[PDB]
Amino acid sequence: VSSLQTTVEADGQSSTAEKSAEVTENKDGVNVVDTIHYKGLIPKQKYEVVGILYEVKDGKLVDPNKPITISNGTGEYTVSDSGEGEWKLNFGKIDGVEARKSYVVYEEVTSVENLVDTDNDGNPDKKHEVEHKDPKDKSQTFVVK
Ligand SMILES: [Mg+2]
């Protein structure tokens, strides 16, 4: 049993569940970072992260097949001893973040090792996969002025 909660930071402005960060169009691009608060991951195991930034309007993806940007971060993430903790994914300074529009971060977390036995043969045969893909999550959304 596992989950991710995520917090987007756009040009130093952090979103919350209550209130999305507001930024001005940057021209040099908007710096986008996502904090991944993970729960119930397998302790001490290595995972890979794919973060995806989408344009969003009224809690629906505008163009779900055309992400603004995709980040793989450092390429490997280590779970805490408790299975709960935080990782930070940098997207970098992102072009195509436009005035009057909102953007939401989606996250996919996948174990490096097979950790899930799906057929009860006693051997893990599947990677552990956890995601947070919520287009209504203010915590993952920022607004451009
Ligand atoms: Mg198996």
Domain that holds residue 93: 3-136
The experimental method behind these coordinates is X-ray
**What is the distance in A from the centroid of ligand 1 to the CA of 43?**
20
Tokens of 106: 């989606």
The reply, when asked if residue 125 is annotated as ligand binding, is yes
Q: Which long-range contacts (CB under 8 A, 24 or more apart) does 13-20 make?
A: 13/142, 15/138, 15/139, 15/140, 15/141, 15/142, 16/138, 16/139, 17/137, 17/138, 17/139, 18/138, 19/138, 20/102, 20/138, 20/141, 20/142, 20/143
Q: Is residue 144 situated within a structural domain? A: no
44: burial class by Cβ within 10 Å (0-12, 13-18, 19+)?
exposed
Q: Is residue 56 situated within a structural domain? A: yes
Rounded distance, CA 133 to CA 138, Å?
12
**What is the distance in A from the centroid of ligand 1 to the CA of 116?**
7
DSSP 18-63: S--EEE---SS-EEEEEEEEEESPPTT-EEEEEEEEEEEETTEES-
Resolution in Å equals: 1.4
**What is the distance in A from the centroid of ligand 1 to the CA of 90?**
35
Domain count, the chain: 1
Tokens of 78: 């280590």
Q: Is residue 122 situated within a structural domain? A: yes
**What is the distance in A from the centroid of ligand 1 to the CA of 127?**
11
Share of the chain residues as helix, strand and coil, in percent rounded to the nearest 5: 0, 55, 45
Q: Is residue 63 situated within a structural domain? A: yes
Q: Is residue 143 situated within a structural domain? A: no
Give the amino acid at 138. K
Q: Is residue 141 situated within a structural domain? A: no
What CATH number is attached to the domain comprising 111? 2.60.40.3930
Rounded distance, CA 22 to CA 11, Å?
9
DSSP 12: T
Q: Which residues are registered as beta bridge partners of 50?
A: 108
The reply, when asked if residue 90 is annotated as ligand binding, is no
